[PDB]
Amino acid sequence: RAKAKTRSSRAGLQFPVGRVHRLLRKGNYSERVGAGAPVYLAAVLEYLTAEILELAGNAARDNKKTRIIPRHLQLAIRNDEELNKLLGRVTIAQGGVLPNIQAVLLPKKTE
Amino acid sequence: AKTRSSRAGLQFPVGRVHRLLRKGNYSERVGAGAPVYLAAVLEYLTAEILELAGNAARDNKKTRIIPRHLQLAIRNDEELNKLLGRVTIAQGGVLPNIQAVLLPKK
Amino acid sequence: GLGKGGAKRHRKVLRDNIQGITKPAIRRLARRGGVKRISGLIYEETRGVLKVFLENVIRDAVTYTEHAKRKTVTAMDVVYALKRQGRTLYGFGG
Amino acid sequence: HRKVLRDNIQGITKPAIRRLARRGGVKRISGLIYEETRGVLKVFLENVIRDAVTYTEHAKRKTVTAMDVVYALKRQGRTLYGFGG
Amino acid sequence: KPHRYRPGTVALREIRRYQKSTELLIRKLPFQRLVREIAQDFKTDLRFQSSAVMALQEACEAYLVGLFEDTNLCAIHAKRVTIMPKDIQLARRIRGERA
Amino acid sequence: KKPHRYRPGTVALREIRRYQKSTELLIRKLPFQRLVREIAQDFKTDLRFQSSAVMALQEACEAYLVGLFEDTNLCAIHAKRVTIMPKDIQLARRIRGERA
Amino acid sequence: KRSRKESYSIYVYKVLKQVHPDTGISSKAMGIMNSFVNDIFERIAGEASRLAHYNKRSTITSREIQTAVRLLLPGELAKHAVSEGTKAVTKYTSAK
Amino acid sequence: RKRSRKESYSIYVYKVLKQVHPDTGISSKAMGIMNSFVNDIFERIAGEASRLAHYNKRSTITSREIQTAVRLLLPGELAKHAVSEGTKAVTKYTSAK
Ligand SMILES: [Ca+2]
Ligand SMILES: [Ca+2]
Ligand SMILES: [Ca+2]
Ligand SMILES: [Ca+2]
Ligand SMILES: [Ca+2]
Ligand SMILES: [Ca+2]
Ligand SMILES: [Ca+2]
Ligand SMILES: [Ca+2]
Ligand SMILES: [Ca+2]
Ligand SMILES: [Cl-]
Ligand SMILES: [Cl-]
Ligand SMILES: [Cl-]
Ligand SMILES: [Cl-]
Ligand SMILES: [K+]
């Protein structure tokens, strides 16, 4: 018996390939799951996770905070055209809204 | 003179429904009652729509249901209309309806 | 059967609490939504709409609770109900 | 010309857009609506056709089927009865 | 003689006419050519079942008719009777189709 | 010497900025909790609730209403008002498909 | 000798004959009826599948169909649907 | 019987956070949001993948169905990167047998 390597480590991934494979088999999605499928899916979940954390991290930094909170995630997502589309029908608890006042409601004089 | 559907008192195919549940990636297993119940519900809803659309065909002096009759049936029934609120019936049209502000005075 | 609402025990009967959704609170919600000025008719109308919203989410939540044979509504029940109604919520499980 | 033959979008005629608006109960129509509608129709077809064609490529076909469109319409929250669902 | 319907009267007649019928209202060949053009941006030398082009047409027309209803309400909400681009825009923003 | 007084709208704009910067729930917790319990009585008697289930519900209500008020604000402005009214809410819910 | 494409059309006809024996149906209308049955099959089965999964069950039973039906249909439709489903299962298990 | 186990993606979320922002951390609630997000996109991808294989009379969800699912679900630039990252991972995985 060789000493064991995680499928994640062979894939060059932080996300759990083996757990993802298991969740695919036990999720009633198809009768059979190919060996590539959880590798690919795990990678995609990592990529998207990385992308949100990149932007929320920036939001945290901008706020003079070390830790990401739900608001930073909300600021990240809503200010990003693409994530906002992906999560267009999703509600982020304790996220708030983007500062946005309609122009007609600002007082006489401009900007 | 038995067939699963006949036992259950149904026109819809209990066996077909059972097979569709099993091969449809819904669960590991399907109990024996599930397809009876499901086929019953499908037949009930099918019967309601056909009762109403058959009436709409009669009302317009026709012997065959066409997509308009189905649309008239569905959209004038408050609950079928909700169940099918995000569905397009091909060749069904819309219900006659003109906002009152657009009508001429008296 | 003996005992009706007090068949199952110990005093948990409810008020008319819709008025506890106050005018000021409704005005704060509108503020977060960018609204600057508010007709006096809005407050009672919002209560209506809020109530309808909760009826629909809770009805489904409780259905999931009855299905699981429980007597306690869970965050997941609500989460599943919200998802069904196309109002997916993040941060409470699932 | 390339007004209809690579903006076939103009083949969506003013008369046709009014007929559509009529079936939607519209009485009167600003002249700027015909261009606006054309933009909207194009975005709609772009989105639906993108997805259908993605279904077509995945099946390794060269011919888009009604089912490709039906699946595409369903993804987009736009379910369609009568074409093979 | 000058026998002439007033502005609006033929519009209402048209509304009653198109609301009664279920036929496609965009001409078929021009629609079909549009489909094939748009499709080329995604993949070249594509073919189409006829029923596919018909399915696309049905969906489009249903979409536009339903969008015209909401647009009409938006115009009426602004005390007009004339649909304008800003009415379409508002319907689409509230429907969540656009930001 | 007159007392100080902001003109109508100025404090409104301030409040808009305040609440748009924060994330804290804006309906008071106990009243909302009772309201939930009361509504659920119509579907099943003697229900318990996890506290997080009530919080889930409040988070979803408030977000729903803040969203609807956005759409409602747009409907008022479309009709050249600055004041939101029931018919604004009604239009937005009708266009959303919440209502017929 | 073409594909072999199943549909609900014979069952749709049979039901039509029960409720309106002297009326018929166009092929496009039959197509819409076919679309409808598949759509509602899927909605119900999908919710049932979820119900079971949420509850760590491996089996979709008539109780998952029933809860799926209550979640999915509007009030009155669901009372009747539940009633017809029950009646059918009762009648099925008593029969033999 | 301590208290039955509850899986989560949070160790992996943390790991990716350290790659991207080494000196940044993350609240419990934010973590809860990230968990929700991962399970949501899992279901969407896996469900579309399930459907793809079903429309094509296939029993097997492969990396090809994951890929097409991703192209249907993700908006443009996210999709290009995701397709790239999932192509890299499979390739790498396969060559490391
Ligand atoms: Ca990566
Ligand atoms: Ca990155
Ligand atoms: Ca009915
Ligand atoms: Ca009648
Ligand atoms: Ca014509
Ligand atoms: Ca004025
Ligand atoms: Ca219901
Ligand atoms: Ca970095
Ligand atoms: Ca999901
Ligand atoms: Cl594979
Ligand atoms: Cl069963
Ligand atoms: Cl305009
Ligand atoms: Cl009003
Ligand atoms: K499934």
Side-chain angles (χ1 to χ4, degrees):
Chain A
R1 164 158 295 188
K3 184 174 193 64
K5 310 183 192 204
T6 70
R7 285 193 274 172
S8 301
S9 68
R10 308 185 198 276
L13 297 177
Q14 255 53 221
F15 264 53
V17 169
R19 187 178 278 183
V20 163
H21 195 241
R22 189 251 298 168
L23 288 169
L24 289 166
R25 280 191 281 92
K26 309 270 269 271
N28 300 290
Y29 297 110
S30 61
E31 203 196 4
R32 341 180 84 235
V33 183
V39 176
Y40 208 112
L41 176 51
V44 173
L45 302 163
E46 196 170 313
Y47 171 63
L48 297 171
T49 301
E51 191 64 56
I52 290 178
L53 293 166
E54 178 69 30
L55 297 165
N58 297 345
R61 215 203 303 111
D62 201 344
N63 251 290
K64 289 105 212 291
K65 303 295 178 57
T66 306
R67 317 224 206 82
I68 291 163
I69 58 170
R71 161 130 280 214
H72 305 143
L73 292 166
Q74 179 75 329
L75 295 173
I77 284 165
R78 300 309 160 197
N79 288 299
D80 194 68
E81 158 167 345
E82 286 203 327
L83 291 164
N84 183 61
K85 195 187 189 152
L86 184 60
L87 309 178
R89 297 274 184 247
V90 156
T91 296
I92 273 152
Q94 280 300 296
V97 299
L98 289 193
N100 195 17
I101 305 185
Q102 296 288 315
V104 300
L105 309 170
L106 297 182
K108 171 60 214 168
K109 293 298 190 179
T110 322
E111 305 284 61
Chain B
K2 340 91 166 177
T3 188
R4 273 213 270 180
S5 300
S6 190
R7 302 192 224 152
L10 305 178
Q11 258 33 234
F12 271 51
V14 176
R16 182 109 111 213
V17 170
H18 200 190
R19 187 252 297 161
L20 290 167
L21 290 172
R22 289 205 220 80
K23 312 256 224 195
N25 297 304
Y26 296 113
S27 50
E28 207 199 319
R29 311 155 92 253
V30 191
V36 170
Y37 200 112
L38 182 50
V41 170
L42 299 172
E43 175 173 322
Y44 166 66
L45 297 170
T46 300
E48 273 310 315
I49 290 171
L50 295 174
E51 164 115 312
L52 294 170
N55 295 355
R58 250 151 221 289
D59 292 344
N60 298 295
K61 300 285 291 100
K62 302 290 219 275
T63 108
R64 291 154 190 179
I65 289 154
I66 64 164
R68 167 127 276 228
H69 305 149
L70 293 175
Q71 172 79 335
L72 288 180
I74 294 159
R75 304 303 165 194
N76 287 293
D77 188 77
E78 281 202 47
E79 294 202 324
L80 292 165
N81 183 53
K82 192 168 150 221
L83 179 65
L84 305 179
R86 307 294 310 191
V87 167
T88 293
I89 288 169
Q91 280 303 293
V94 306
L95 296 189
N97 178 256
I98 297 179
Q99 296 287 296
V101 296
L102 304 179
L103 292 186
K105 305 149 169 173
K106 158 58 209 157
Chain C
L2 27 290
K4 308 75 44 175
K8 282 99 86 284
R9 272 261 223 162
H10 281 37
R11 272 262 285 102
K12 35 182 126 43
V13 197
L14 273 296
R15 210 179 273 243
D16 193 3
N17 303 286
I18 199 74
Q19 263 3 260
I21 317 303
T22 56
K23 185 186 175 188
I26 293 167
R27 156 179 300 250
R28 294 189 288 273
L29 291 168
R31 290 289 178 253
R32 189 164 283 164
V35 176
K36 192 193 168 175
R37 207 166 179 270
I38 299 167
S39 167
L41 300 175
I42 284 289
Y43 310 108
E44 196 52 40
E45 193 76 9
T46 302
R47 292 184 185 108
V49 168
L50 170 52
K51 186 160 155 148
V52 167
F53 181 85
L54 285 168
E55 280 167 5
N56 294 212
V57 177
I58 294 168
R59 190 195 294 115
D60 283 4
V62 168
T63 301
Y64 285 116
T65 307
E66 281 148 31
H67 188 80
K69 290 152 164 163
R70 296 187 263 89
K71 300 173 99 299
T72 300
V73 177
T74 58
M76 291 316 297
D77 290 334
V78 173
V79 170
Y80 294 133
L82 292 161
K83 187 144 82 212
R84 266 207 84 253
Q85 306 284 336
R87 297 215 60 88
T88 300
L89 171 78
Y90 278 11
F92 286 91
Chain D
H1 197 33
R2 219 261 286 95
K3 184 176 171 74
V4 178
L5 252 295
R6 287 298 100 177
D7 262 331
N8 292 266
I9 204 69
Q10 300 290 334
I12 313 315
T13 56
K14 176 171 165 178
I17 293 161
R18 294 163 74 73
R19 279 195 293 280
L20 294 169
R22 294 294 179 237
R23 185 167 280 163
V26 174
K27 187 185 194 177
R28 205 169 181 278
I29 304 178
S30 162
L32 302 168
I33 269 179
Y34 310 105
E35 267 318 288
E36 196 81 1
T37 305
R38 286 187 190 105
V40 165
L41 170 56
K42 201 202 216 167
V43 167
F44 176 99
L45 278 168
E46 270 158 19
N47 299 341
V48 179
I49 289 165
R50 186 183 311 130
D51 284 2
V53 162
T54 293
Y55 282 111
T56 307
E57 283 163 345
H58 186 92
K60 294 144 155 180
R61 279 192 276 91
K62 310 221 126 194
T63 301
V64 180
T65 54
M67 291 306 306
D68 294 332
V69 174
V70 172
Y71 296 140
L73 286 165
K74 192 152 231 148
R75 280 209 71 249
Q76 304 290 338
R78 219 99 224 330
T79 301
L80 174 67
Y81 283 7
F83 289 90
Chain E
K1 71 168 136 178
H3 169 252
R4 282 252 301 177
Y5 289 112
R6 287 140 92 172
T9 295
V10 189
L12 289 164
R13 266 218 310 286
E14 284 177 24
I15 296 167
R16 282 187 248 271
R17 186 194 161 177
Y18 293 121
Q19 291 194 341
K20 199 170 289 171
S21 67
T22 70
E23 82 285 16
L24 293 166
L25 301 173
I26 296 171
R27 274 122 22 102
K28 299 192 198 189
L29 269 49
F31 182 75
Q32 187 176 130
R33 285 189 313 262
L34 175 56
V35 169
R36 295 181 187 286
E37 176 183 330
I38 289 170
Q40 274 249 308
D41 296 359
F42 302 125
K43 174 163 179 192
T44 53
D45 301 309
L46 269 178
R47 280 151 180 257
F48 276 83
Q49 297 193 327
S50 38
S51 63
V53 177
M54 289 331 276
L56 280 160
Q57 207 177 335
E58 289 272 356
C60 286
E61 287 189 27
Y63 173 75
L64 291 171
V65 169
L67 179 60
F68 278 126
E69 293 154 9
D70 295 345
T71 300
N72 204 16
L73 293 185
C74 287
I76 293 160
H77 183 70
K79 310 180 172 308
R80 293 183 275 93
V81 157
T82 303
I83 56 161
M84 293 184 187
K86 68 179 129 172
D87 302 318
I88 289 183
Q89 282 154 36
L90 177 65
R92 297 216 321 137
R93 149 86 263 266
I94 288 174
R95 287 175 159 217
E97 289 168 28
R98 73 163 221 159
Chain F
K1 299 229 153 194
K2 286 200 199 76
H4 188 280
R5 170 168 280 272
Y6 286 104
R7 309 213 295 197
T10 300
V11 185
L13 269 352
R14 200 147 76 215
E15 286 181 8
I16 299 192
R17 292 186 202 109
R18 172 180 162 182
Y19 294 119
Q20 288 186 349
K21 191 189 311 188
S22 64
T23 66
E24 84 284 34
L25 297 175
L26 302 174
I27 298 168
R28 309 221 73 191
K29 299 206 202 327
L30 252 48
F32 183 84
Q33 199 187 138
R34 290 188 233 112
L35 178 72
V36 164
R37 286 180 193 282
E38 171 193 337
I39 288 167
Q41 264 173 195
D42 317 332
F43 308 129
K44 187 171 163 165
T45 61
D46 292 303
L47 283 164
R48 278 139 193 272
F49 281 85
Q50 300 190 334
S51 34
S52 64
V54 176
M55 286 319 118
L57 283 166
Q58 203 180 333
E59 282 288 332
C61 279
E62 292 193 19
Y64 169 76
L65 298 174
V66 168
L68 181 63
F69 281 130
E70 284 160 7
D71 294 357
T72 293
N73 208 30
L74 288 190
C75 290
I77 293 166
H78 184 71
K80 304 161 194 285
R81 280 180 289 94
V82 142
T83 309
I84 58 159
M85 305 178 168
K87 64 181 162 199
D88 300 317
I89 292 173
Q90 296 157 26
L91 181 65
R93 295 183 65 245
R94 148 113 258 300
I95 283 163
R96 287 173 166 220
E98 284 173 31
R99 152 219 236 297
Chain G
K1 62 141 146 174
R2 217 145 93 202
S3 313
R4 204 94 168 201
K5 309 214 148 173
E6 296 185 333
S7 67
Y8 292 95
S9 83
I10 59 174
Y11 318 100
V12 175
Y13 265 109
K14 287 174 169 153
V15 174
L16 173 56
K17 265 41 166 100
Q18 294 187 147
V19 300
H20 284 299
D22 301 317
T23 127
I25 188 166
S26 85
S27 81
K28 290 146 158 267
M30 186 53 98
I32 292 163
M33 290 306 285
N34 209 55
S35 283
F36 163 80
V37 175
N38 284 307
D39 180 7
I40 284 139
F41 187 114
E42 178 55 45
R43 302 193 202 177
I44 291 170
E47 184 57 56
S49 181
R50 274 176 248 125
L51 250 350
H53 189 90
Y54 295 162
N55 291 293
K56 286 109 148 267
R57 315 219 154 293
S58 312
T59 316
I60 287 165
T61 83
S62 52
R63 191 176 177 264
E64 280 80 39
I65 304 303
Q66 174 164 93
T67 304
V69 164
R70 288 206 163 104
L71 288 162
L72 283 155
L73 306 200
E76 229 66 43
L77 231 37
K79 287 176 202 192
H80 291 79
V82 167
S83 173
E84 293 292 324
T86 312
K87 155 178 161 165
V89 168
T90 301
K91 170 155 171 35
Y92 176 82
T93 52
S94 305
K96 204 107 299 279
Chain H
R1 203 230 270 170
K2 283 164 129 201
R3 194 214 250 63
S4 28
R5 296 180 22 159
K6 307 299 227 162
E7 279 184 350
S8 133
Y9 285 103
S10 61
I11 60 168
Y12 319 105
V13 170
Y14 256 109
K15 281 168 180 191
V16 173
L17 175 55
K18 296 322 177 144
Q19 294 186 252
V20 148
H21 283 300
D23 292 314
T24 294
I26 184 163
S27 80
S28 169
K29 282 171 178 194
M31 190 49 86
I33 288 146
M34 299 301 301
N35 245 279
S36 280
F37 173 78
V38 180
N39 285 312
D40 185 2
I41 286 144
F42 187 106
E43 276 156 17
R44 303 192 202 184
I45 290 166
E48 187 55 64
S50 180
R51 271 175 252 111
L52 276 156
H54 187 81
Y55 306 151
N56 294 265
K57 288 118 143 286
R58 257 64 180 288
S59 316
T60 313
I61 288 171
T62 72
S63 67
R64 211 175 158 267
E65 285 70 43
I66 301 305
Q67 176 161 107
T68 307
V70 167
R71 291 203 167 285
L72 298 160
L73 281 149
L74 299 198
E77 210 60 49
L78 248 23
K80 287 168 193 187
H81 280 272
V83 163
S84 189
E85 293 299 330
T87 302
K88 280 180 190 164
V90 170
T91 306
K92 186 161 158 60
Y93 174 83
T94 313
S95 84
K97 283 267 153 292

